[PDB]
Amino acid sequence: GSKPNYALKFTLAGHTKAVSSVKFSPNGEWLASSSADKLIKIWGAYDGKFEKTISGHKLGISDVAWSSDSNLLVSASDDKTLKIWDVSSGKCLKTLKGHSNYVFCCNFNPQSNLIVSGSFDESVRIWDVKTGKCLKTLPAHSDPVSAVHFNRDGSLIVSSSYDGLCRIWDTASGQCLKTLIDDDNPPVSFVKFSPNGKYILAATLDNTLKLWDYSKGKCLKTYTGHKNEKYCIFANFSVTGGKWIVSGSEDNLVYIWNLQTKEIVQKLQGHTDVVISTACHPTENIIASAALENDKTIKLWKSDC
Ligand SMILES: CO[C@@H](CCc1nc(CO)c[nH]1)c1ccccc1
């Protein structure tokens, strides 16, 4: 349990351009991947078995997210839309139109009655899942929005931007509750709530990750050693074994840190391009990593701790 020993189990091939994101289904069954090749692909979490392709976006996809019940996907595309997909039928249920530029990031709230989106048009939008109508448009940032995430009860949204700010929003009213990172720069490339909704993990494009106390609005911890000057790279709370922070890197490696000691406890070697996206399995010690154009594969890693 002390230090993880993640080892390569499967390499998943199929995507013909850069992979943009990977996410495990909450029920642990599936990995979903999105790509610059305009496709979503579904894989078996435990054996990497290719299950299907999902098609309909007219341009590249930047993000994909799962509903609580593992039955829906939402995707964010350069075609300026989001799409809600029934995963079982592979059919597009709704197209979410309203953004005036690339949609970069998306997530379901835990109720999975709302979707939150971030765009190059510098706004965050909230969508009704059943009707696909836009409920609210938040003038959230003054540069592209890099990440959006709901907290554990869906009462708050956290957003991040190249404008160098991290903000938190009241879901119901869409009013700003606070501006957490108010620095002019470095650009905030990623943010998400901790599983308890108490902290916020934030990446800045100066090779730095930080853990913030949302309530107190102050930085508890700092993680470094990786390379992150250009890309919006996902980061994760690993909580099934040892308590880790997980991130990709522009040196083609996956970085794992001890959350408390801030020490590098593993570096995963295999990718041949920037590791843009990592995801942690909800019940087993498994990591999915995915990489850009020169590589285009997804790797599944497994650990005893
Ligand atoms: C090169 O940038 C990636 C962006 C990946 C990403 N990070 C976040 C953080 O919330 C969202 N999405 C990408 C974009 C489009 C096609 C392929 C790759």
Side-chain angles (χ1 to χ4, degrees):
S2 157
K3 291 186 188 166
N5 61 336
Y6 281 98
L8 181 55
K9 296 309 182 201
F10 307 98
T11 301
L12 281 45
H15 282 298
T16 59
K17 297 195 181 180
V19 183
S20 57
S21 68
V22 291
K23 309 284 178 67
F24 286 109
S25 63
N27 72 7
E29 213 157 39
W30 303 125
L31 187 71
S33 62
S34 65
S35 173
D37 68 11
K38 316 183 198 166
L39 307 173
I40 293 148
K41 290 174 170 285
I42 307 298
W43 322 77
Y46 307 115
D47 63 353
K49 201 209 153 199
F50 172 76
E51 184 67 9
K52 65 180 83 184
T53 296
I54 300 190
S55 296
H57 279 295
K58 298 194 279 180
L59 289 174
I61 304 171
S62 295
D63 206 1
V64 66
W66 291 97
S67 64
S68 306
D69 67 5
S70 297
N71 288 330
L72 301 187
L73 285 175
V74 63
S75 56
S77 178
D78 291 353
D79 70 11
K80 291 173 174 183
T81 74
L82 298 109
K83 280 178 187 289
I84 304 167
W85 309 91
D86 180 291
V87 165
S88 201
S89 77
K91 283 184 138 79
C92 181
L93 299 180
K94 297 269 172 269
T95 297
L96 315 189
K97 325 158 204 284
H99 281 300
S100 62
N101 210 329
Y102 307 145
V103 198
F104 198 70
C105 46
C106 57
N107 262 311
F108 283 90
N109 65 359
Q111 296 98 305
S112 292
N113 69 305
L114 300 166
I115 288 157
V116 65
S117 66
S119 182
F120 272 61
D121 72 12
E122 312 191 348
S123 81
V124 163
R125 288 182 172 246
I126 302 160
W127 311 81
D128 184 48
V129 166
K130 219 209 81 179
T131 69
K133 283 215 175 80
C134 189
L135 294 187
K136 289 188 195 67
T137 296
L138 314 187
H141 294 274
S142 60
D143 278 301
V145 182
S146 52
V148 291
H149 193 241
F150 285 100
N151 73 324
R152 189 184 51 194
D153 68 0
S155 78
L156 301 177
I157 292 150
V158 62
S159 69
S160 69
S161 173
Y162 284 85
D163 71 0
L165 304 174
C166 173
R167 291 214 245 235
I168 289 82
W169 311 85
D170 180 59
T171 295
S173 76
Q175 302 304 308
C176 193
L177 279 157
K178 64 173 68 175
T179 307
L180 187 61
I181 305 197
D182 206 326
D183 265 40
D184 216 62
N185 84 314
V188 188
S189 43
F190 183 72
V191 291
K192 82 181 299 175
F193 284 107
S194 70
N196 54 354
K198 275 192 42 165
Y199 316 115
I200 291 176
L201 183 55
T204 43
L205 284 189
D206 57 3
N207 311 294
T208 299
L209 274 147
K210 293 200 198 158
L211 188 54
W212 290 81
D213 190 303
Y214 156 63
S215 76
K216 291 167 206 193
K218 65 179 185 175
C219 173
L220 298 191
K221 312 269 168 172
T222 299
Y223 313 89
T224 55
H226 70 303
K227 168 79 178 298
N228 190 202
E229 270 165 357
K230 179 159 195 267
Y231 293 99
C232 294
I233 298 180
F234 289 88
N236 319 98
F237 300 86
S238 199
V239 311
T240 55
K243 307 295 177 169
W244 324 126
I245 300 296
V246 182
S247 190
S249 186
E250 295 162 2
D251 66 349
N252 308 0
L253 295 182
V254 176
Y255 281 74
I256 315 173
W257 292 267
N258 184 294
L259 184 150
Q260 299 290 358
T261 85
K262 310 165 285 179
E263 284 310 319
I264 297 182
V265 294
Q266 247 200 302
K267 298 170 59 181
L268 305 190
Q269 188 248 47
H271 281 293
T272 57
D273 206 344
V274 172
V275 182
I276 189 65
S277 178
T278 51
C280 299
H281 196 281
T283 58
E284 307 299 303
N285 303 331
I286 298 162
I287 292 173
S289 67
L292 297 182
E293 310 89 58
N294 185 67
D295 172 318
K296 304 180 275 191
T297 68
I298 301 148
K299 288 171 190 296
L300 294 172
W301 316 78
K302 157 114 172 75
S303 181
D304 294 310
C305 307

PDB file of all heavy atoms in Angstrom, residues 18-20 36 61-63 104-105 146-147 189-190 231-232 234 276 292, ligand 1:
ATOM      1  N   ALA A  18      -4.711  12.509 -32.567  1.00  0.00           N
ATOM      2  CA  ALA A  18      -4.541  12.783 -31.122  1.00  0.00           C
ATOM      3  C   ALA A  18      -5.790  12.353 -30.342  1.00  0.00           C
ATOM      4  O   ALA A  18      -6.910  12.677 -30.777  1.00  0.00           O
ATOM      5  CB  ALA A  18      -4.258  14.256 -30.920  1.00  0.00           C
ATOM      6  N   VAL A  19      -5.602  11.632 -29.245  1.00  0.00           N
ATOM      7  CA  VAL A  19      -6.657  11.381 -28.226  1.00  0.00           C
ATOM      8  C   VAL A  19      -6.729  12.644 -27.360  1.00  0.00           C
ATOM      9  O   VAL A  19      -5.680  13.250 -27.136  1.00  0.00           O
ATOM     10  CB  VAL A  19      -6.350  10.111 -27.410  1.00  0.00           C
ATOM     11  CG1 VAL A  19      -7.453   9.788 -26.415  1.00  0.00           C
ATOM     12  CG2 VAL A  19      -6.099   8.916 -28.323  1.00  0.00           C
ATOM     13  N   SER A  20      -7.930  13.067 -26.964  1.00  0.00           N
ATOM     14  CA  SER A  20      -8.175  14.323 -26.207  1.00  0.00           C
ATOM     15  C   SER A  20      -8.557  14.043 -24.748  1.00  0.00           C
ATOM     16  O   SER A  20      -8.182  14.854 -23.897  1.00  0.00           O
ATOM     17  CB  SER A  20      -9.206  15.164 -26.887  1.00  0.00           C
ATOM     18  OG  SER A  20     -10.422  14.456 -27.057  1.00  0.00           O
ATOM     19  N   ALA A  36      -9.379  13.944 -31.792  1.00  0.00           N
ATOM     20  CA  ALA A  36      -9.323  14.933 -32.893  1.00  0.00           C
ATOM     21  C   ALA A  36      -9.868  14.299 -34.174  1.00  0.00           C
ATOM     22  O   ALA A  36     -10.123  15.053 -35.123  1.00  0.00           O
ATOM     23  CB  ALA A  36      -7.904  15.416 -33.096  1.00  0.00           C
ATOM     24  N   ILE A  61     -13.155  16.266 -31.348  1.00  0.00           N
ATOM     25  CA  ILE A  61     -13.755  16.236 -29.979  1.00  0.00           C
ATOM     26  C   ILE A  61     -12.644  16.488 -28.956  1.00  0.00           C
ATOM     27  O   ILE A  61     -11.611  15.794 -29.024  1.00  0.00           O
ATOM     28  CB  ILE A  61     -14.473  14.896 -29.695  1.00  0.00           C
ATOM     29  CG1 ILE A  61     -15.549  14.583 -30.742  1.00  0.00           C
ATOM     30  CG2 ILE A  61     -15.039  14.886 -28.281  1.00  0.00           C
ATOM     31  CD1 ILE A  61     -16.145  13.187 -30.633  1.00  0.00           C
ATOM     32  N   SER A  62     -12.884  17.397 -28.009  1.00  0.00           N
ATOM     33  CA  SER A  62     -11.915  17.806 -26.962  1.00  0.00           C
ATOM     34  C   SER A  62     -12.194  17.103 -25.635  1.00  0.00           C
ATOM     35  O   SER A  62     -11.258  16.982 -24.863  1.00  0.00           O
ATOM     36  CB  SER A  62     -11.910  19.288 -26.793  1.00  0.00           C
ATOM     37  OG  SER A  62     -11.445  19.905 -27.980  1.00  0.00           O
ATOM     38  N   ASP A  63     -13.426  16.678 -25.358  1.00  0.00           N
ATOM     39  CA  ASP A  63     -13.757  16.096 -24.028  1.00  0.00           C
ATOM     40  C   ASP A  63     -14.967  15.178 -24.145  1.00  0.00           C
ATOM     41  O   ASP A  63     -15.825  15.415 -25.010  1.00  0.00           O
ATOM     42  CB  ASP A  63     -14.022  17.196 -22.986  1.00  0.00           C
ATOM     43  CG  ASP A  63     -13.769  16.823 -21.523  1.00  0.00           C
ATOM     44  OD1 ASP A  63     -13.357  15.662 -21.261  1.00  0.00           O
ATOM     45  OD2 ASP A  63     -13.969  17.709 -20.644  1.00  0.00           O
ATOM     46  N   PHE A 104     -14.678  23.007 -25.368  1.00  0.00           N
ATOM     47  CA  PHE A 104     -13.405  22.406 -24.915  1.00  0.00           C
ATOM     48  C   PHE A 104     -13.628  21.374 -23.799  1.00  0.00           C
ATOM     49  O   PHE A 104     -12.872  20.384 -23.760  1.00  0.00           O
ATOM     50  CB  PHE A 104     -12.436  23.493 -24.442  1.00  0.00           C
ATOM     51  CG  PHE A 104     -10.993  23.042 -24.376  1.00  0.00           C
ATOM     52  CD1 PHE A 104     -10.278  22.778 -25.536  1.00  0.00           C
ATOM     53  CD2 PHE A 104     -10.354  22.853 -23.162  1.00  0.00           C
ATOM     54  CE1 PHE A 104      -8.949  22.365 -25.481  1.00  0.00           C
ATOM     55  CE2 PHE A 104      -9.036  22.423 -23.108  1.00  0.00           C
ATOM     56  CZ  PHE A 104      -8.332  22.187 -24.267  1.00  0.00           C
ATOM     57  N   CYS A 105     -14.578  21.602 -22.893  1.00  0.00           N
ATOM     58  CA  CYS A 105     -14.731  20.762 -21.682  1.00  0.00           C
ATOM     59  C   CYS A 105     -16.205  20.587 -21.328  1.00  0.00           C
ATOM     60  O   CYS A 105     -17.021  21.436 -21.686  1.00  0.00           O
ATOM     61  CB  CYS A 105     -13.926  21.332 -20.513  1.00  0.00           C
ATOM     62  SG  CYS A 105     -14.116  23.119 -20.287  1.00  0.00           S
ATOM     63  N   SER A 146     -10.792  26.273 -19.949  1.00  0.00           N
ATOM     64  CA  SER A 146      -9.951  25.056 -20.048  1.00  0.00           C
ATOM     65  C   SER A 146     -10.620  23.866 -19.332  1.00  0.00           C
ATOM     66  O   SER A 146     -10.348  22.711 -19.731  1.00  0.00           O
ATOM     67  CB  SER A 146      -8.571  25.340 -19.494  1.00  0.00           C
ATOM     68  OG  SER A 146      -8.655  25.913 -18.195  1.00  0.00           O
ATOM     69  N   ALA A 147     -11.442  24.115 -18.305  1.00  0.00           N
ATOM     70  CA  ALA A 147     -12.052  23.043 -17.494  1.00  0.00           C
ATOM     71  C   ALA A 147     -13.297  23.535 -16.743  1.00  0.00           C
ATOM     72  O   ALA A 147     -13.362  24.721 -16.367  1.00  0.00           O
ATOM     73  CB  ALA A 147     -11.011  22.486 -16.554  1.00  0.00           C
ATOM     74  N   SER A 189      -4.846  25.701 -16.654  1.00  0.00           N
ATOM     75  CA  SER A 189      -5.051  24.711 -17.747  1.00  0.00           C
ATOM     76  C   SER A 189      -6.028  23.603 -17.339  1.00  0.00           C
ATOM     77  O   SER A 189      -6.502  22.901 -18.234  1.00  0.00           O
ATOM     78  CB  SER A 189      -3.730  24.139 -18.183  1.00  0.00           C
ATOM     79  OG  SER A 189      -2.920  23.830 -17.063  1.00  0.00           O
ATOM     80  N   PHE A 190      -6.290  23.423 -16.049  1.00  0.00           N
ATOM     81  CA  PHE A 190      -7.203  22.369 -15.540  1.00  0.00           C
ATOM     82  C   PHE A 190      -7.607  22.642 -14.093  1.00  0.00           C
ATOM     83  O   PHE A 190      -6.778  23.166 -13.317  1.00  0.00           O
ATOM     84  CB  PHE A 190      -6.559  20.985 -15.607  1.00  0.00           C
ATOM     85  CG  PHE A 190      -7.504  19.895 -15.166  1.00  0.00           C
ATOM     86  CD1 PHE A 190      -8.567  19.516 -15.971  1.00  0.00           C
ATOM     87  CD2 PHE A 190      -7.362  19.273 -13.933  1.00  0.00           C
ATOM     88  CE1 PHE A 190      -9.458  18.541 -15.555  1.00  0.00           C
ATOM     89  CE2 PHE A 190      -8.251  18.290 -13.530  1.00  0.00           C
ATOM     90  CZ  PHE A 190      -9.296  17.928 -14.338  1.00  0.00           C
ATOM     91  N   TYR A 231      -0.190  22.550 -22.762  1.00  0.00           N
ATOM     92  CA  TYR A 231      -1.435  21.762 -22.989  1.00  0.00           C
ATOM     93  C   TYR A 231      -2.301  21.734 -21.736  1.00  0.00           C
ATOM     94  O   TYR A 231      -1.776  21.796 -20.606  1.00  0.00           O
ATOM     95  CB  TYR A 231      -1.082  20.355 -23.478  1.00  0.00           C
ATOM     96  CG  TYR A 231      -0.453  20.361 -24.846  1.00  0.00           C
ATOM     97  CD1 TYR A 231       0.920  20.284 -25.003  1.00  0.00           C
ATOM     98  CD2 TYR A 231      -1.232  20.520 -25.984  1.00  0.00           C
ATOM     99  CE1 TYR A 231       1.503  20.328 -26.261  1.00  0.00           C
ATOM    100  CE2 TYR A 231      -0.667  20.568 -27.247  1.00  0.00           C
ATOM    101  CZ  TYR A 231       0.706  20.481 -27.382  1.00  0.00           C
ATOM    102  OH  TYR A 231       1.272  20.528 -28.611  1.00  0.00           O
ATOM    103  N   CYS A 232      -3.610  21.628 -21.942  1.00  0.00           N
ATOM    104  CA  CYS A 232      -4.611  21.475 -20.859  1.00  0.00           C
ATOM    105  C   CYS A 232      -4.685  19.989 -20.484  1.00  0.00           C
ATOM    106  O   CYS A 232      -5.373  19.218 -21.166  1.00  0.00           O
ATOM    107  CB  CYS A 232      -5.949  22.074 -21.273  1.00  0.00           C
ATOM    108  SG  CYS A 232      -5.868  23.876 -21.480  1.00  0.00           S
ATOM    109  N   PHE A 234      -5.220  16.761 -17.928  1.00  0.00           N
ATOM    110  CA  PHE A 234      -6.116  16.320 -16.836  1.00  0.00           C
ATOM    111  C   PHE A 234      -5.260  15.908 -15.654  1.00  0.00           C
ATOM    112  O   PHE A 234      -4.122  15.486 -15.843  1.00  0.00           O
ATOM    113  CB  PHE A 234      -6.994  15.142 -17.251  1.00  0.00           C
ATOM    114  CG  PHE A 234      -8.076  15.480 -18.236  1.00  0.00           C
ATOM    115  CD1 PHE A 234      -7.828  15.446 -19.601  1.00  0.00           C
ATOM    116  CD2 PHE A 234      -9.349  15.807 -17.800  1.00  0.00           C
ATOM    117  CE1 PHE A 234      -8.835  15.736 -20.515  1.00  0.00           C
ATOM    118  CE2 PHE A 234     -10.353  16.095 -18.711  1.00  0.00           C
ATOM    119  CZ  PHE A 234     -10.088  16.072 -20.069  1.00  0.00           C
ATOM    120  N   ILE A 276      -1.891  13.578 -22.565  1.00  0.00           N
ATOM    121  CA  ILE A 276      -2.846  14.710 -22.423  1.00  0.00           C
ATOM    122  C   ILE A 276      -3.891  14.410 -21.342  1.00  0.00           C
ATOM    123  O   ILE A 276      -4.494  15.382 -20.812  1.00  0.00           O
ATOM    124  CB  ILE A 276      -3.526  14.988 -23.769  1.00  0.00           C
ATOM    125  CG1 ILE A 276      -4.343  16.279 -23.727  1.00  0.00           C
ATOM    126  CG2 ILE A 276      -4.372  13.795 -24.211  1.00  0.00           C
ATOM    127  CD1 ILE A 276      -3.504  17.533 -23.531  1.00  0.00           C
ATOM    128  N   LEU A 292      -0.960  12.247 -27.686  1.00  0.00           N
ATOM    129  CA  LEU A 292      -1.270  13.088 -28.883  1.00  0.00           C
ATOM    130  C   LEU A 292      -0.752  12.442 -30.187  1.00  0.00           C
ATOM    131  O   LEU A 292      -0.206  11.332 -30.125  1.00  0.00           O
ATOM    132  CB  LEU A 292      -0.697  14.489 -28.630  1.00  0.00           C
ATOM    133  CG  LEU A 292      -1.311  15.242 -27.446  1.00  0.00           C
ATOM    134  CD1 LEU A 292      -0.708  16.626 -27.311  1.00  0.00           C
ATOM    135  CD2 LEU A 292      -2.826  15.364 -27.581  1.00  0.00           C
TER     136      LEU A 292
HETATM  137  C1  LIG B   1      -4.439  19.481 -27.510  1.00  0.00           C
HETATM  138  O1  LIG B   1      -5.471  19.707 -26.564  1.00  0.00           O
HETATM  139  C2  LIG B   1      -6.310  18.623 -26.225  1.00  0.00           C
HETATM  140  C3  LIG B   1      -7.194  19.116 -25.072  1.00  0.00           C
HETATM  141  C4  LIG B   1      -7.547  18.044 -24.046  1.00  0.00           C
HETATM  142  C5  LIG B   1      -8.418  18.572 -22.918  1.00  0.00           C
HETATM  143  N1  LIG B   1      -7.998  18.941 -21.680  1.00  0.00           N
HETATM  144  C6  LIG B   1      -9.060  19.347 -20.988  1.00  0.00           C
HETATM  145  C7  LIG B   1      -9.031  19.844 -19.539  1.00  0.00           C
HETATM  146  O2  LIG B   1     -10.332  20.038 -19.030  1.00  0.00           O
HETATM  147  C8  LIG B   1     -10.158  19.227 -21.823  1.00  0.00           C
HETATM  148  N2  LIG B   1      -9.738  18.751 -22.980  1.00  0.00           N
HETATM  149  C9  LIG B   1      -7.030  18.197 -27.509  1.00  0.00           C
HETATM  150  C10 LIG B   1      -8.056  18.973 -28.072  1.00  0.00           C
HETATM  151  C11 LIG B   1      -8.679  18.578 -29.254  1.00  0.00           C
HETATM  152  C12 LIG B   1      -8.280  17.406 -29.880  1.00  0.00           C
HETATM  153  C13 LIG B   1      -7.247  16.630 -29.328  1.00  0.00           C
HETATM  154  C14 LIG B   1      -6.621  17.027 -28.146  1.00  0.00           C
END
